[PDB]
Amino acid sequence: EKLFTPLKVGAVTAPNRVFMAPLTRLRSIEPGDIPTPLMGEYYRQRASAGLIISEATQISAQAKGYAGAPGLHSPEQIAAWKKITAGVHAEDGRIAVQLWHTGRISHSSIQPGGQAPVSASALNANTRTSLRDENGNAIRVDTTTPRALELDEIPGIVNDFRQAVANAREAGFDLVELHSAHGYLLHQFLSPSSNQRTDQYGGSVENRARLVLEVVDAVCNEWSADRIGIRVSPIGTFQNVDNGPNEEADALYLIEELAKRGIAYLHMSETDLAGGKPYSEAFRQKVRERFHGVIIGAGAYTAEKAEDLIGKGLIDAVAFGRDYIANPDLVARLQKKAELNPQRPESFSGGGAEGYTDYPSL
Ligand SMILES: Cc1cc2nc3c(=O)[nH]c(=O)nc-3n(C[C@H](O)[C@H](O)[C@H](O)COP(=O)(O)O)c2cc1C
């Protein structure tokens, strides 16, 4: 077994390869999109993970697409996250913040000024996001048609990622993960399905990847390349965003570009919850030969699949999502071959302590 052996992940050393995937739980305070001590307790419970990757966190108020998702743009958010990271560190854990802009997976009612959310192009996501009703409970609501960003707005978006990274470093995170997956803003630019622009940010794969690579360069400059990871979902369809008619070649282009920056890790979200065709081993080999940082695999993994792919030299670590919701001590359970706690999906999104901090350890 290799899952319980250490791994250098850029600037930090994980004691094992069992990572906590980023999981949106929608329990932040409004007004202010503020993390809470309850969230702190939840993360502290999971500190034995090789690496915790936080729930997706707004780089700016405009970035918001979900009621209850936290930000990392305001003083009050910075202060609240500082307490959370301190708690994880007191338990000898490591925690990365996943930073997003939701782009068109959003609703005007939660945007600044009540305005349409932004994207690469003015095309509805044709999906839902999560708002809160009058009692503060999560509700699914159809997405608002976005406004296409003007060319002169792009530097501001890059700066918002840069600023959020400055704030994340201050807040005590060990790493940052850029959310370039699952049909959110960066992926909206990457995908031809959502990007119909005819300027330098659309058309060719070079142009479609331009924004994400500008963001990577800006955040490496703000902090250090060995503090930066990126999550992609570049093969298949996620929240109605496919990866276009040349998905493999386009993915390999992006990955070769990322490699030039010497970033800490590449996190591949391989499938959504409904599943689909597995990655070919040929594709995994092509990725592996092009990227020289850590590769994290995710999407309905088992420990056995993770061991197989680590043993084949194709990935370095695995991120578990739902098993981490339900098992604060997932590392010990996988090490001991213990049963896993029964998941309660009704409390994944929104609410309070129930279904959040009340899953027991062994
Ligand atoms: C409730 C829930 C929230 C999620 N939130 C995020 C998120 O904030 N960021 C992200 O990149 N993926 C998110 N995902 C996807 C998970 O990180 C993970 O890739 C997915 O659940 C599949 O892995 P699993 O089979 O181990 O759960 C979420 C998944 C679930 C079920």
PDB file of N, CA and C in Angstrom, residues 149-201:
ATOM      1  N   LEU A 149     -18.439  39.319 -20.562  1.00  0.00           N
ATOM      2  CA  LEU A 149     -17.426  40.270 -20.112  1.00  0.00           C
ATOM      3  C   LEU A 149     -16.877  41.066 -21.283  1.00  0.00           C
ATOM      4  N   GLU A 150     -16.702  42.361 -21.085  1.00  0.00           N
ATOM      5  CA  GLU A 150     -16.002  43.199 -22.058  1.00  0.00           C
ATOM      6  C   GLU A 150     -14.511  42.907 -21.972  1.00  0.00           C
ATOM      7  N   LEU A 151     -13.807  43.096 -23.078  1.00  0.00           N
ATOM      8  CA  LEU A 151     -12.366  42.865 -23.089  1.00  0.00           C
ATOM      9  C   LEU A 151     -11.676  43.637 -21.968  1.00  0.00           C
ATOM     10  N   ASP A 152     -12.096  44.878 -21.735  1.00  0.00           N
ATOM     11  CA  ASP A 152     -11.426  45.694 -20.730  1.00  0.00           C
ATOM     12  C   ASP A 152     -11.789  45.315 -19.290  1.00  0.00           C
ATOM     13  N   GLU A 153     -12.700  44.354 -19.101  1.00  0.00           N
ATOM     14  CA  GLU A 153     -12.999  43.805 -17.768  1.00  0.00           C
ATOM     15  C   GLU A 153     -12.103  42.621 -17.401  1.00  0.00           C
ATOM     16  N   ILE A 154     -11.397  42.056 -18.373  1.00  0.00           N
ATOM     17  CA  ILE A 154     -10.616  40.846 -18.100  1.00  0.00           C
ATOM     18  C   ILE A 154      -9.476  41.086 -17.093  1.00  0.00           C
ATOM     19  N   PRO A 155      -8.701  42.182 -17.235  1.00  0.00           N
ATOM     20  CA  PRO A 155      -7.660  42.417 -16.218  1.00  0.00           C
ATOM     21  C   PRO A 155      -8.194  42.473 -14.784  1.00  0.00           C
ATOM     22  N   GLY A 156      -9.396  43.013 -14.610  1.00  0.00           N
ATOM     23  CA  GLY A 156     -10.018  43.061 -13.293  1.00  0.00           C
ATOM     24  C   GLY A 156     -10.285  41.673 -12.720  1.00  0.00           C
ATOM     25  N   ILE A 157     -10.734  40.745 -13.563  1.00  0.00           N
ATOM     26  CA  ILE A 157     -10.955  39.362 -13.131  1.00  0.00           C
ATOM     27  C   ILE A 157      -9.625  38.720 -12.690  1.00  0.00           C
ATOM     28  N   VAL A 158      -8.579  38.902 -13.493  1.00  0.00           N
ATOM     29  CA  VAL A 158      -7.256  38.399 -13.127  1.00  0.00           C
ATOM     30  C   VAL A 158      -6.815  38.989 -11.783  1.00  0.00           C
ATOM     31  N   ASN A 159      -6.994  40.300 -11.620  1.00  0.00           N
ATOM     32  CA  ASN A 159      -6.647  40.947 -10.361  1.00  0.00           C
ATOM     33  C   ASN A 159      -7.463  40.412  -9.178  1.00  0.00           C
ATOM     34  N   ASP A 160      -8.740  40.086  -9.398  1.00  0.00           N
ATOM     35  CA  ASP A 160      -9.558  39.538  -8.314  1.00  0.00           C
ATOM     36  C   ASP A 160      -9.003  38.187  -7.847  1.00  0.00           C
ATOM     37  N   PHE A 161      -8.581  37.328  -8.780  1.00  0.00           N
ATOM     38  CA  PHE A 161      -7.918  36.082  -8.374  1.00  0.00           C
ATOM     39  C   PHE A 161      -6.617  36.371  -7.602  1.00  0.00           C
ATOM     40  N   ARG A 162      -5.805  37.289  -8.122  1.00  0.00           N
ATOM     41  CA  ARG A 162      -4.543  37.662  -7.461  1.00  0.00           C
ATOM     42  C   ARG A 162      -4.791  38.154  -6.023  1.00  0.00           C
ATOM     43  N   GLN A 163      -5.744  39.069  -5.890  1.00  0.00           N
ATOM     44  CA  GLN A 163      -6.101  39.643  -4.594  1.00  0.00           C
ATOM     45  C   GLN A 163      -6.593  38.564  -3.623  1.00  0.00           C
ATOM     46  N   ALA A 164      -7.434  37.667  -4.116  1.00  0.00           N
ATOM     47  CA  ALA A 164      -7.954  36.591  -3.274  1.00  0.00           C
ATOM     48  C   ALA A 164      -6.807  35.683  -2.810  1.00  0.00           C
ATOM     49  N   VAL A 165      -5.796  35.487  -3.649  1.00  0.00           N
ATOM     50  CA  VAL A 165      -4.626  34.714  -3.231  1.00  0.00           C
ATOM     51  C   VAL A 165      -3.808  35.439  -2.158  1.00  0.00           C
ATOM     52  N   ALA A 166      -3.614  36.753  -2.309  1.00  0.00           N
ATOM     53  CA  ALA A 166      -2.986  37.532  -1.235  1.00  0.00           C
ATOM     54  C   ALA A 166      -3.771  37.340   0.070  1.00  0.00           C
ATOM     55  N   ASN A 167      -5.098  37.410  -0.029  1.00  0.00           N
ATOM     56  CA  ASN A 167      -5.939  37.250   1.145  1.00  0.00           C
ATOM     57  C   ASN A 167      -5.842  35.831   1.734  1.00  0.00           C
ATOM     58  N   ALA A 168      -5.761  34.819   0.860  1.00  0.00           N
ATOM     59  CA  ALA A 168      -5.668  33.408   1.277  1.00  0.00           C
ATOM     60  C   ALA A 168      -4.361  33.132   2.026  1.00  0.00           C
ATOM     61  N   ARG A 169      -3.265  33.662   1.493  1.00  0.00           N
ATOM     62  CA  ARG A 169      -1.956  33.541   2.137  1.00  0.00           C
ATOM     63  C   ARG A 169      -2.032  34.171   3.537  1.00  0.00           C
ATOM     64  N   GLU A 170      -2.582  35.382   3.619  1.00  0.00           N
ATOM     65  CA  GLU A 170      -2.766  36.039   4.915  1.00  0.00           C
ATOM     66  C   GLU A 170      -3.659  35.192   5.851  1.00  0.00           C
ATOM     67  N   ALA A 171      -4.717  34.604   5.301  1.00  0.00           N
ATOM     68  CA  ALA A 171      -5.665  33.839   6.108  1.00  0.00           C
ATOM     69  C   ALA A 171      -5.098  32.515   6.613  1.00  0.00           C
ATOM     70  N   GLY A 172      -3.879  32.153   6.195  1.00  0.00           N
ATOM     71  CA  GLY A 172      -3.190  31.003   6.758  1.00  0.00           C
ATOM     72  C   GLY A 172      -3.376  29.705   5.982  1.00  0.00           C
ATOM     73  N   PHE A 173      -3.967  29.767   4.790  1.00  0.00           N
ATOM     74  CA  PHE A 173      -4.029  28.571   3.954  1.00  0.00           C
ATOM     75  C   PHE A 173      -2.619  28.138   3.546  1.00  0.00           C
ATOM     76  N   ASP A 174      -2.438  26.829   3.387  1.00  0.00           N
ATOM     77  CA  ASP A 174      -1.146  26.270   2.996  1.00  0.00           C
ATOM     78  C   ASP A 174      -0.935  26.295   1.481  1.00  0.00           C
ATOM     79  N   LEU A 175      -2.034  26.192   0.732  1.00  0.00           N
ATOM     80  CA  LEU A 175      -2.030  26.190  -0.739  1.00  0.00           C
ATOM     81  C   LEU A 175      -3.330  26.852  -1.205  1.00  0.00           C
ATOM     82  N   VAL A 176      -3.371  27.183  -2.495  1.00  0.00           N
ATOM     83  CA  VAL A 176      -4.618  27.585  -3.138  1.00  0.00           C
ATOM     84  C   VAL A 176      -4.876  26.662  -4.319  1.00  0.00           C
ATOM     85  N   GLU A 177      -6.151  26.307  -4.502  1.00  0.00           N
ATOM     86  CA  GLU A 177      -6.592  25.543  -5.663  1.00  0.00           C
ATOM     87  C   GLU A 177      -7.485  26.428  -6.526  1.00  0.00           C
ATOM     88  N   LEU A 178      -7.075  26.690  -7.762  1.00  0.00           N
ATOM     89  CA  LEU A 178      -7.921  27.441  -8.690  1.00  0.00           C
ATOM     90  C   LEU A 178      -9.033  26.537  -9.227  1.00  0.00           C
ATOM     91  N   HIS A 179     -10.289  26.997  -9.152  1.00  0.00           N
ATOM     92  CA  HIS A 179     -11.410  26.193  -9.616  1.00  0.00           C
ATOM     93  C   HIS A 179     -11.608  26.417 -11.111  1.00  0.00           C
ATOM     94  N   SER A 180     -10.927  25.597 -11.907  1.00  0.00           N
ATOM     95  CA  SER A 180     -10.996  25.671 -13.372  1.00  0.00           C
ATOM     96  C   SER A 180     -11.837  24.535 -13.961  1.00  0.00           C
ATOM     97  N   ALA A 181     -12.805  24.057 -13.174  1.00  0.00           N
ATOM     98  CA  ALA A 181     -13.602  22.885 -13.504  1.00  0.00           C
ATOM     99  C   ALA A 181     -15.109  23.185 -13.426  1.00  0.00           C
ATOM    100  N   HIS A 182     -15.877  22.151 -13.761  1.00  0.00           N
ATOM    101  CA  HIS A 182     -17.305  22.021 -13.434  1.00  0.00           C
ATOM    102  C   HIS A 182     -18.193  23.126 -13.984  1.00  0.00           C
ATOM    103  N   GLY A 183     -17.759  23.752 -15.073  1.00  0.00           N
ATOM    104  CA  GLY A 183     -18.590  24.741 -15.728  1.00  0.00           C
ATOM    105  C   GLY A 183     -18.619  26.109 -15.062  1.00  0.00           C
ATOM    106  N   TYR A 184     -17.696  26.394 -14.138  1.00  0.00           N
ATOM    107  CA  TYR A 184     -17.608  27.741 -13.529  1.00  0.00           C
ATOM    108  C   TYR A 184     -16.777  28.672 -14.445  1.00  0.00           C
ATOM    109  N   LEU A 185     -16.420  29.880 -13.995  1.00  0.00           N
ATOM    110  CA  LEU A 185     -16.002  30.919 -14.957  1.00  0.00           C
ATOM    111  C   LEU A 185     -14.796  30.506 -15.790  1.00  0.00           C
ATOM    112  N   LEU A 186     -13.760  29.982 -15.146  1.00  0.00           N
ATOM    113  CA  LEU A 186     -12.560  29.613 -15.893  1.00  0.00           C
ATOM    114  C   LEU A 186     -12.870  28.534 -16.951  1.00  0.00           C
ATOM    115  N   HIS A 187     -13.682  27.547 -16.576  1.00  0.00           N
ATOM    116  CA  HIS A 187     -14.088  26.492 -17.501  1.00  0.00           C
ATOM    117  C   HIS A 187     -15.009  27.048 -18.600  1.00  0.00           C
ATOM    118  N   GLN A 188     -15.831  28.048 -18.267  1.00  0.00           N
ATOM    119  CA  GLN A 188     -16.680  28.706 -19.274  1.00  0.00           C
ATOM    120  C   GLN A 188     -15.836  29.316 -20.405  1.00  0.00           C
ATOM    121  N   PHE A 189     -14.669  29.858 -20.064  1.00  0.00           N
ATOM    122  CA  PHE A 189     -13.736  30.331 -21.089  1.00  0.00           C
ATOM    123  C   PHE A 189     -13.043  29.169 -21.813  1.00  0.00           C
ATOM    124  N   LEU A 190     -12.646  28.128 -21.081  1.00  0.00           N
ATOM    125  CA  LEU A 190     -11.944  26.996 -21.711  1.00  0.00           C
ATOM    126  C   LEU A 190     -12.784  26.269 -22.764  1.00  0.00           C
ATOM    127  N   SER A 191     -14.083  26.132 -22.509  1.00  0.00           N
ATOM    128  CA  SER A 191     -14.933  25.285 -23.345  1.00  0.00           C
ATOM    129  C   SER A 191     -15.501  26.027 -24.550  1.00  0.00           C
ATOM    130  N   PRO A 192     -15.375  25.445 -25.760  1.00  0.00           N
ATOM    131  CA  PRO A 192     -16.047  26.070 -26.914  1.00  0.00           C
ATOM    132  C   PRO A 192     -17.576  26.123 -26.800  1.00  0.00           C
ATOM    133  N   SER A 193     -18.168  25.252 -25.990  1.00  0.00           N
ATOM    134  CA  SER A 193     -19.630  25.192 -25.829  1.00  0.00           C
ATOM    135  C   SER A 193     -20.188  26.434 -25.136  1.00  0.00           C
ATOM    136  N   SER A 194     -19.392  27.011 -24.249  1.00  0.00           N
ATOM    137  CA  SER A 194     -19.803  28.177 -23.475  1.00  0.00           C
ATOM    138  C   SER A 194     -19.091  29.456 -23.923  1.00  0.00           C
ATOM    139  N   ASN A 195     -18.050  29.318 -24.740  1.00  0.00           N
ATOM    140  CA  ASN A 195     -17.251  30.460 -25.171  1.00  0.00           C
ATOM    141  C   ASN A 195     -17.399  30.631 -26.677  1.00  0.00           C
ATOM    142  N   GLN A 196     -18.176  31.639 -27.076  1.00  0.00           N
ATOM    143  CA  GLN A 196     -18.361  31.984 -28.490  1.00  0.00           C
ATOM    144  C   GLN A 196     -17.700  33.323 -28.814  1.00  0.00           C
ATOM    145  N   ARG A 197     -16.756  33.750 -27.975  1.00  0.00           N
ATOM    146  CA  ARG A 197     -16.055  35.011 -28.208  1.00  0.00           C
ATOM    147  C   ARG A 197     -15.209  34.966 -29.471  1.00  0.00           C
ATOM    148  N   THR A 198     -15.035  36.130 -30.088  1.00  0.00           N
ATOM    149  CA  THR A 198     -14.227  36.252 -31.294  1.00  0.00           C
ATOM    150  C   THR A 198     -13.078  37.249 -31.083  1.00  0.00           C
ATOM    151  N   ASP A 199     -12.720  37.497 -29.817  1.00  0.00           N
ATOM    152  CA  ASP A 199     -11.530  38.274 -29.468  1.00  0.00           C
ATOM    153  C   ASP A 199     -10.402  37.341 -28.977  1.00  0.00           C
ATOM    154  N   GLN A 200      -9.379  37.897 -28.329  1.00  0.00           N
ATOM    155  CA  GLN A 200      -8.215  37.109 -27.912  1.00  0.00           C
ATOM    156  C   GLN A 200      -8.522  36.113 -26.793  1.00  0.00           C
ATOM    157  N   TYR A 201      -9.752  36.119 -26.276  1.00  0.00           N
ATOM    158  CA  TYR A 201     -10.158  35.181 -25.224  1.00  0.00           C
ATOM    159  C   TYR A 201     -11.134  34.112 -25.709  1.00  0.00           C
TER     160      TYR A 201
END
